[PDB]
């Protein structure tokens, strides 16, 4: 029937004919095609967004994504603890919902459960069925979780969860979400998150990185496309004033991004970026900033050195610091804007060679693992595959040495930000001029922007050790200047 | 010629005849039996309370108890280090003798030696003979420790040691201590602790948990007996409006509580509980609770959510905080009260099944290891014995995720207690008043009770993950309210 | 024929003649001798300071010195991080150059390159050629390091570097440096540090500890030799009111001291000591002590309990604490003075017995490893080799128990110092008399000297657990007494 179909659907024809899924019948993935043909457009075929469908001919990539492993140091690692990645989180994000719960990332099959379950998502509404003994279960979101209802309370929770959230945890809304979550789809940015979640059965789909119609490498994330289109020539994935991406737009409803070849920097940047997906405040005007605003589904693709002036180049911030009152950027996982322009990036290395390395599955067949690898934990396949002369110790030595040097500056950045913050509050009480407290607000704004980036970022400098050193020394520098002048004012008050 | 004795010791007759300890001559465990008959009861037989008699017949329980293990991470682990179980100890407990030293617990054979030598015990009077190189020595207290004498001074120590303290470190005084440490025996609660220590040759006797005459499961601790006797139907060890304790009293002098079935929850709540074995202060009068008072040898047998009310009820608190003056409860190792009502306790699982798992000896009869275990360190016997589907990685994952989540809240609640103490110092200097300060001081009590319980308790929430989260979020919420009504009042002044 | 040489070089003959080296011709280690012979004394021979030559007949000492090792925890471990050796470094050293960077030690082969590349040396001017990927490279300094230039800057760096630093990283200047760096040689204390770094291709040479001429155990370190000569009956290496060491003063220009027997406390003592090698400030007048003053190249040879007196007595302190203006001593790695009169010292054990344990070559010859060892990593032959009853884990438990107890005190000293500095600052800002801030400042001095000795020393109390206890408790005491004088003096103002 395929020629019948292609009559009103030529983008699928253009993707699929002469592709590597050429021979796959429209019926392996779309149900009720007959009722579509026989009573027309009105009756849509059913497209069950499902890794198992891809799995039936790609068992390795399917079983590797779903394999359960137990890190014996456990999961749900709060960042905010003394020996954690963000030891002065509570002080430095005072005001922000990340103060309720922010844990370290774990495996991809858990991304839906984990966002819905975290204390900051929806007031603790959603919970693991059977609780802790079932924290390692993978598969279907609502086989794993229960919903204790709209009116349930859990103490020391928050209500950060929103529709745009879901776009970096599932390919489930790919046909039910119009571009940037403007209206006209099943869901949009203004939708109740508690409607949206019951539609989310799967983590990141096979379809997120790989065209089902043609097996092309690709991207579906709306905000990323918006960003690769705002800057096709000078964006972090660009080359020669051009990017290996061509947008296909359906009905003016949705868009995909076929790259002529693999750039896992782009597949991975669909979620491993800094992003605004939340309500905010305006810098100029002080007005709230709403889900009706398209800055609430937004990929800046700026690094640590650029992000402050970007969020000023859009009169956008996330939150006032509960003490200093400074208009702060909330930073999240910028692995893409970090990795950009680094040693490995420069050398043509992409996320997949370190994070999805080659393994012998089947009975003796080669593939890329789709359970993403933590490389310190797999130096032979993550590092020595390329660095042929490296011993496991040397590989580990390198990752940890860079981590050590970076974390040293991260930790000092925090010492100074804590010092600014406390110094600010002493200034206020010693009555210090409110004109100056502004000046200091800008210094906390700067010092925070060049620090929080790196706790938000997951590599402790490995992804870009020069950018991390220039950033974090930047932060230390802004805080000392900020504490200097506050301290200067607090003697002048008394002079 | 037992019936001769039985003629006169009838409670002993009842425990011993038809029992597993039927055939044992009285002489085996008592000496001087002739002068007692021949001279009369003025001349008491000697009762050398000693593991090694039990060891003659029970070698695998004796060996495993005294077996010397070295953990390569060491012990004398101070809980008030940055990466410790209680990193904010010195600040949250200020005024408390625990600020002098509080280590993590080690194995049961060290318990007298570590009680005697701790910096908080008796001004450093008692030290390991030959110093650090003998810190792993097991055996008789005074073979291991030396007495520096009463006039020895050692910097930065405390004098928390009293008689009652020994009641959770050894069986040696079982016949030298009237019920509750009331005046009557060789030692009471008013005895000089320096006379008491010379009488303690062994750690916890075999007879602590086991009747010497018939071998029936028992408790000997006068606190634990007393608590249960009080709350006979509803206490944390009950089932169906009663408790499994057959309570035998000897000469109206002392008592054992005997059980038809092994209940290790009770066997361990002889020591692993919250207690008061110390002087304190009445909440109403400000005046002393000396060792005169029965509240200085007291088991609440209540959990985190009940203890502030319990001790409020019996007009008792432990120390004013050094900054805030809050009438605080000092919390100690409430494992039995935390475990009460958890998923494992509801399964009917007891302390012993995780902490004394089935092992085999030289020949290989199956014994319960009396070298108690750290389950994370032996997940095959402690976990996988019962959870048959768990791998070691799985068992480790289940322990550490739960400790991870719980620790995240413990660290957050310590951040909020320190902020609460810090803003109180400020509110004093900012001239807010006894009324606003007495209310904030009330928020310190509550959030101290709902936190310290958990640094006191040794599971980091494994024993009761739901209780922990309820309590620690409660603590956070209380500190948050406290801080709210300080900084508010701090503006009320200068407005 | 070496007899010509000897006629004008008396003291070389006396070292070489009838030694294990005697037969080795002068031309093995000296070029331009035929030129020296003909063209007079005006043509000084070439003697290249070069481990390769010592190497040629001392294979296994050489190869072990240069052997690549990769610690899987990496290197460049900042000490001022929460989990780290000196968590409160940034607060307690506020106003000293170590706040810019201070990492744990690695291998000797790295000593010059880490000295010149550390952020606190010369404004980030020296960096690894090819960056992090070459950070494990050994051998020649200017093979591994690039000079970025005098004009270049790197943010948040310091300029602590000076020629005297090089005396504890290299032997290369043993024929180029007046005794103690006084004026006369190609390099002296007043030299531009960047001229001196050009001359240093090698770390500590074989000649640091072994006489090239007759292979006698010696020290070549000017300021140690000077320390001893000054206090020859009562210094730390003395027995019987005599040190084992004849000082040989060649041309009145350069001293060495030769050993009758191997004393590694002395040899290792050439670097593993507290020193002054930096400008500071006289206490009596507050006047600078510049490189003109011989106190800028100075070995006290005093333990934690003597240094405060010592620096008062020679009228000198390094820096003012940024907050308290306390006249603070900067401590560095006081290892041999820590070790002096410890249980191991008094038992005649030497540094080399633990740190250069016997291992054997491939050819199968036994030797002392010159890749200096971290005992916890290698207890088999740093410990068990002497303590044969010791299991691997007992050796670890022993090291780690001592470290555990000491760091418990160390962190408490740090908590109380931070309390003192936050109280000194409150106290100031509530306007307590300068006389009573002066009282506070002396306690800060005393607290400080008793605490920072142990963060700079490398063992966390293992080397001398008794001295560490008595010093750190002395610190806590000094701090608490300060905190009390400030809180009482605070209440006095507003009385
Ligand atoms: C023109 C006469 C069509 C033929 C022949 C087929 N399809 Fe179709 N399809 C068509 C329209 C005009 C629309 C949607 C627009 C509307 O408002 O009705 C569709 C929709 C689909 C979809 C769903 C997309 C979504 O929003 O979820 C699918 C998966 C689809 N069609 C598949 C399909 C197949 C497999 C066909 C051959 C058997 C086929 N279509 C025929 C128009 C026409
Ligand atoms: C959005 C749909 C994502 C895409 C595309 C990718 N990742 Fe991701 N990743 C995401 C989440 C939400 C999480 C955490 C899940 C949780 O429940 O906590 C992750 C996790 C990783 C990790 C950690 C791996 C582990 O701990 O077991 C790595 C190393 C990681 N992600 C890397 C990665 C790479 C290299 C990608 C391109 C191939 C990639 N991810 C895609 C969200 C999303
Ligand atoms: C090899 C040169 C790498 C490339 C290319 C990328 N990453 Fe990485 N990443 C690498 C290391 C050595 C580490 C340290 C942590 C570790 O496990 O060893 C990281 C860290 C991450 C993380 C944190 C989780 C983890 O894997 O431990 C994430 C989520 C991650 N990296 C993602 C990521 C993405 C999206 C990349 C392309 C932009 C990327 N990494 C590149 C090694 C390498
Ligand atoms: C060891 C295996 C024992 C044998 C055999 C017997 N007894 Fe014992 N007895 C033993 C201990 C360790 C103790 C101390 C207290 C305790 O409850 O554990 C005792 C105590 C007694 C007492 C004191 C009872 C009282 O009034 O307090 C009596 C009167 C006594 N034991 C008597 C007794 C008789 C008559 C025995 C032979 C029939 C006998 N014991 C055997 C340990 C052991
Ligand atoms: C008082 C007599 C006790 C009774 C009854 C029990 N325990 Fe205990 N325990 C006690 C002390 C004083 C210590 C610390 C000893 C020290 O010197 O530090 C402990 C320790 C434990 C530990 C930790 C063991 C380790 O090697 O670290 C566990 C796991 C433990 N105790 C468990 C336990 C159980 C399960 C009991 C009933 C079965 C029990 N204890 C009884 C004091 C006393
Ligand atoms: C309480 C903290 C205990 C102390 C002190 C000692 N034992 Fe024990 N023992 C205890 C429990 C909870 C159990 C399990 C009982 C069950 O229901 O399975 C045991 C068990 C024994 C046994 C029976 C066989 C076995 O399980 O190993 C014997 C023979 C035994 N214990 C002897 C013994 C001796 C000689 C002791 C002193 C060194 C000793 N026990 C101490 C609890 C406690
Ligand atoms: C398995 C279901 C358990 C039962 C039943 C009990 N405990 Fe436990 N305990 C358990 C874990 C997994 C841990 C954490 C630390 C570890 O070693 O894994 C603990 C911890 C303790 C400690 C701290 C010492 C330690 O082992 O690290 C003590 C002193 C302790 N537990 C006592 C205890 C008592 C008295 C119990 C019955 C009320 C009890 N535990 C039950 C696992 C389990
Ligand atoms: C049988 C003797 C058990 C031993 C020993 C341990 N566990 Fe267990 N556990 C068991 C039962 C019957 C239950 C009730 C729920 C169920 O699985 O049917 C549990 C519960 C847990 C849970 C959930 C805990 C909770 O608070 O909800 C976990 C995570 C768990 N068990 C793990 C575990 C580990 C790691 C153990 C060794 C330290 C362990 N258990 C001992 C049965 C038994
Ligand atoms: C290498 C094993 C050597 C051999 C063989 C000889 N010399 Fe040497 N010499 C050597 C070094 C590394 C140095 C630097 C100083 C030090 O003590 O380590 C020296 C120094 C001299 C000097 C200068 C001494 C002074 O005046 O301060 C002289 C005059 C000297 N050496 C002479 C000498 C002669 C005559 C030898 C053959 C009999 C001879 N040296 C052998 C290294 C080595
Ligand atoms: C012989 C050359 C030794 C080497 C190598 C090490 N130790 Fe030692 N130790 C030794 C002696 C002769 C003594 C004195 C005690 C005696 O009876 O002679 C010691 C002392 C210790 C101690 C007690 C330490 C104290 O501070 O008093 C411990 C805990 C100890 N030693 C452990 C130890 C470890 C772990 C070693 C490797 C790092 C080690 N020692 C080396 C003899 C020798
Ligand atoms: C008749 C009356 C007898 C007989 C035949 C025996 N005992 Fe005793 N015994 C008796 C009294 C009045 C007391 C004193 C109680 C007190 O002073 O508090 C005792 C004491 C003991 C004890 C001492 C308990 C303790 O250690 O303080 C023991 C262990 C004891 N008796 C044992 C014992 C045995 C083994 C007998 C048969 C050989 C025996 N008694 C006979 C009274 C009487
Ligand atoms: C008589 C005069 C002689 C003879 C026969 C030799 N030397 Fe050698 N030497 C001599 C003097 C006066 C000096 C010093 C020059 C000065 O003081 O400025 C030296 C110097 C050396 C050195 C270098 C020391 C340094 O760098 O500071 C070496 C290594 C040395 N002399 C070696 C040497 C050898 C091997 C000889 C026999 C071939 C020899 N000298 C002969 C004076 C005299
Ligand atoms: C300072 C300390 C050092 C330096 C810089 C070098 N060595 Fe080595 N050396 C040292 C000690 C304390 C010892 C042990 C001596 C003893 O136990 O009494 C040694 C030992 C040697 C030996 C003898 C063989 C052995 O015991 O291993 C040789 C041949 C030796 N040392 C040579 C040597 C070389 C060639 C060096 C430069 C690579 C070198 N040492 C450095 C102390 C020190
Ligand atoms: Ca953001
Ligand atoms: Ca208590
Ligand atoms: Ca110094």
């Amino acid at each position: 029937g395929r020629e019948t179909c292609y009559a009103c659907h030529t983008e699928v024809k253009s993707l699929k004919e002469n592709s590597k899924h050429a021979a796959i019948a429209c019926t392996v993935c779309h149900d009720k095609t007959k009722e579509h043909l026989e009573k027309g457009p009105d009756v849509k075929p059913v497209t069950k967004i499902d890794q198992a469908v891809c799995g039936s001919c790609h068992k390795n990539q399917y079983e590797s994504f779903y394999a359960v492993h137990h890190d014996p140091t456990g999961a749900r690692k709060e960042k905010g603890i003394p020996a954690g990645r963000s030891p002065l989180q509570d002080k430095l994000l005072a005001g922000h919902g990340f103060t309720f719960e922010h844990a370290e990332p774990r495996g991809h099959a858990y991304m839906v459960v984990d966002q819905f379950a975290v204390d900051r998502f929806q007031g603790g509404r959603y919970q693991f069925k059977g609780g802790w003994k079932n924290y390692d279960k993978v598969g279907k979101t609502w086989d794993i979780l229960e919903d204790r209802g709209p009116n349930a309370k859990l103490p020391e929770t928050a209500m950060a969860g929103n529709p745009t959230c879901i776009q970096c945890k599932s390919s489930d809304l790919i046909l039910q979400w119009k571009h940037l979550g403007e209206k006209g789809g099943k869901f949009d940015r203004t939708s109740n998150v508690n409607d949206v979640v019951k539609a989310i059965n799967n983590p990141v789909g096979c379809i997120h990185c790989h065209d089902p119609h043609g097996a092309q490498p690709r991207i579906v994330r709306d905000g990323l496309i918006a960003a690769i289109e705002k800057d096709p020539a000078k964006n972090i994935f660009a080359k020669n004033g051009k990017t290996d991406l061509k947008v296909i737009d359906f009905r003016g409803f949705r868009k995909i991004g076929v790259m002529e070849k693999t750039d896992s920097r782009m597949m991975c940047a669909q979620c491993h970026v800094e992003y605004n997906c939340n309500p905010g405040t305006q810098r100029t005007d002080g007005k709230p900033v709403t889900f009706a605003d398209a800055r609430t589904n937004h990929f800046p693709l700026k690094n640590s050195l650029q992000l402050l002036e970007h969020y000023r180049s859009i009169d956008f911030f996330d939150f006032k610091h509960a003490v200093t009152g400074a208009k702060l950027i909330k930073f999240q996982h910028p692995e893409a804007e970090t990795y950009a322009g680094s040693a490995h990036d420069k050398a043509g290395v992409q996320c997949h060679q370190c994070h999805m390395p080659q393994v012998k599955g089947k009975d003796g067949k080669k593939y890329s693992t789709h359970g993403v690898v933590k490389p310190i934990q797999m130096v032979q396949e993550s590092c020595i595959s390329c660095h042929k002369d490296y011993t496991p110790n040397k590989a580990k030595f390198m990752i940890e040495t860079i981590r050590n040097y970076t974390k040293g500056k991260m930790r000092k950045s925090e010492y100074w930000l804590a010092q600014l913050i406390d110094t600010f509050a002493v200034a206020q009480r010693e009555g210090v001029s409110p004109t100056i407290l502004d000046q200091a607000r800008l210094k906390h704004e700067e010092a925070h922007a060049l620090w929080e980036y790196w706790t938000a970022e997951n590599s402790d400098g490995f992804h870009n050790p020069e950018q991390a050193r220039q950033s974090l020394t930047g932060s230390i520098s802004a805080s000392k200047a900020g504490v200097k002048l506050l301290n200067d004012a607090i003697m002048a008050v008394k002079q």
Side-chain angles (χ1 to χ4, degrees), chain A:
Chain A
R2 28 150 93 254
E3 276 323 304
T4 297
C5 311
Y6 290 153
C8 325
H9 304 306
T10 32
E11 295 91 327
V12 168
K13 192 182 176 33
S14 162
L15 283 172
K16 179 166 161 70
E17 273 326 69
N18 295 131
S19 84
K20 318 262 252 224
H21 290 160
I24 323 197
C26 294
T27 35
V28 168
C29 301
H30 303 270
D31 283 332
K32 283 199 201 187
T33 56
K34 286 304 312 188
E35 302 192 20
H36 182 54
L37 268 189
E38 229 167 38
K39 79 213 282 187
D42 264 4
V43 166
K44 293 223 258 53
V46 211
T47 308
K48 295 138 173 217
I49 298 316
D50 191 350
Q51 292 102 319
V53 166
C54 310
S56 65
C57 305
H58 293 294
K59 70 158 210 156
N60 262 313
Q61 300 77 15
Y62 179 87
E63 307 159 16
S64 71
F65 186 85
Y66 278 111
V68 165
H69 330 95
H70 301 105
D71 183 321
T73 61
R76 210 108 182 249
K77 278 161 191 153
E78 171 64 44
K79 272 164 76 161
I81 66 194
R85 303 210 42 258
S86 187
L88 271 160
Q89 191 165 273
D90 287 323
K91 179 184 213 55
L92 271 45
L93 316 188
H96 200 271
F98 275 37
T99 61
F100 289 98
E101 186 166 9
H102 169 42
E104 284 198 15
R106 71 166 166 163
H108 279 169
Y110 298 112
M111 57 175 58
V112 166
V113 284
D114 279 348
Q115 170 181 263
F116 294 174
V118 72
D119 291 354
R120 83 182 182 262
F121 181 73
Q122 198 74 182
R125 176 180 175 147
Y126 307 98
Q127 295 307 332
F128 282 91
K129 275 171 201 215
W132 277 120
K133 63 181 169 291
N134 294 322
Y135 194 67
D136 59 335
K137 283 205 172 158
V138 298
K140 296 277 171 195
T141 298
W142 298 112
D143 292 349
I144 301 176
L145 302 166
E146 70 192 46
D147 175 7
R148 51 209 53 199
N151 299 132
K153 299 140 202 191
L154 226 220
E156 285 322 297
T157 54
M159 296 291 279
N162 80 54
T164 292
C165 292
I166 276 52
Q167 298 292 298
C168 286
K169 319 282 199 267
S170 192
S171 335
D172 276 10
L173 300 177
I174 188 161
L175 299 179
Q176 292 169 61
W177 178 262
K178 188 182 129 73
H179 207 63
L180 303 166
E182 304 294 344
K183 297 199 155 115
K186 187 62 232 250
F187 307 110
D188 68 85
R189 298 195 303 270
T190 86
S191 301
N192 174 297
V193 71
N194 300 302
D195 295 307
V196 190
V197 294
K198 256 264 137 73
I200 322 301
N201 310 110
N202 312 289
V204 61
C206 300
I207 58 162
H208 223 84
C209 296
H210 308 300
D211 193 82
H213 295 132
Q216 283 105 348
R218 69 156 211 189
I219 57 143
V220 311
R221 185 51 150 91
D222 61 5
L224 185 38
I225 291 154
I228 299 173
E229 294 161 339
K230 174 157 204 161
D231 199 349
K234 325 234 186 134
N235 74 83
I236 63 160
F237 311 102
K239 191 206 264 187
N240 287 284
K242 272 202 273 94
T243 299
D244 192 5
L245 200 63
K246 258 55 53 74
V247 193
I248 314 186
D249 181 357
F250 305 77
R251 308 171 265 122
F253 187 81
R254 55 178 286 272
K255 288 162 218 170
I256 66 164
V258 160
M259 54 201 86
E260 282 322 90
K261 10 281 227 82
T262 295
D263 185 346
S264 60
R265 295 166 320 159
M266 272 175 9
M267 280 131 132
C268 306
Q270 308 182 73
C271 323
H272 295 269
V273 284
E274 157 54 20
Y275 83 93
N276 202 69
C277 57
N278 35 281
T281 297
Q282 252 176 173
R283 313 190 153 256
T284 66
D285 66 58
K287 286 285 155 275
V289 180
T290 77
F291 290 138
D293 210 306
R295 280 171 288 168
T296 60
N297 188 13
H298 168 78
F299 290 35
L301 308 166
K302 307 285 148 200
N303 71 32
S304 73
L305 299 185
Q306 300 174 322
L307 272 172
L308 178 46
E309 256 60 60
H310 178 78
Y311 279 123
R312 293 211 282 222
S313 89
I314 65 156
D315 186 16
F316 188 87
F317 70 99
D318 288 84
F319 86 108
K320 288 208 286 173
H321 188 275
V323 166
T324 57
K327 315 200 177 143
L328 288 177
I329 300 166
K330 181 67 188 86
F331 288 84
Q332 296 109 316
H333 37 67
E335 291 74 54
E337 321 94 301
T338 307
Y339 188 73
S342 67
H344 285 93
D345 190 39
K346 276 221 233 83
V349 180
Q350 300 176 348
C351 325
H352 94 262
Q353 291 159 272
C354 300
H355 291 291
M356 294 177 52
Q358 300 297 291
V359 324
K360 205 146 55 140
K362 291 216 164 305
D363 321 296
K365 190 74 181 175
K366 173 190 190 84
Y367 81 93
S368 317
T369 181
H370 278 64
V372 283
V373 152
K374 324 211 306 207
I376 195 64
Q377 297 192 330
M378 210 177 278
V379 296
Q380 172 52 55
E381 19 275 43
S382 293
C383 304
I384 301 166
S385 60
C386 205
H387 285 291
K388 224 159 297 306
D389 66 290
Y390 269 29
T391 68
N393 278 337
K394 170 140 163 172
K396 282 159 161 170
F397 169 87
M398 285 303 189
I399 293 171
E400 288 304 11
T401 289
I402 282 131
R403 280 226 291 191
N404 286 340
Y405 177 81
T406 309
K407 281 183 305 167
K409 304 299 163 157
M410 275 175 82
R411 284 318 62 102
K412 201 178 305 300
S413 285
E414 292 153 353
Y415 172 75
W416 279 97
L417 273 154
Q419 195 183 313
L420 189 55
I421 285 163
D422 287 339
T423 282
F424 179 104
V426 154
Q428 220 150 18
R429 290 195 291 285
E430 293 288 302
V432 146
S433 145
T435 272
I436 295 159
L437 295 181
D438 307 44
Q439 310 190 264
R441 267 164 192 118
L442 299 186
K443 281 313 174 178
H444 183 190
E445 215 172 311
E446 170 141 338
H448 170 91
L450 291 164
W451 158 75
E452 204 223 349
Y453 193 94
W454 294 87
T455 58
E457 216 267 340
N458 271 296
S459 81
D460 300 298
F462 192 86
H463 290 156
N464 202 329
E466 304 90 336
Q467 175 183 151
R469 189 199 190 282
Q470 216 208 287
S471 200
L472 294 162
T473 58
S475 183
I476 295 158
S477 275
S479 284
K480 288 198 193 164
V483 166
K484 162 108 298 166
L485 76 81
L486 281 171
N487 279 149
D488 280 351
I490 304 167
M491 290 333 187
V493 121
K494 255 134 142 194
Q495 277 150 25

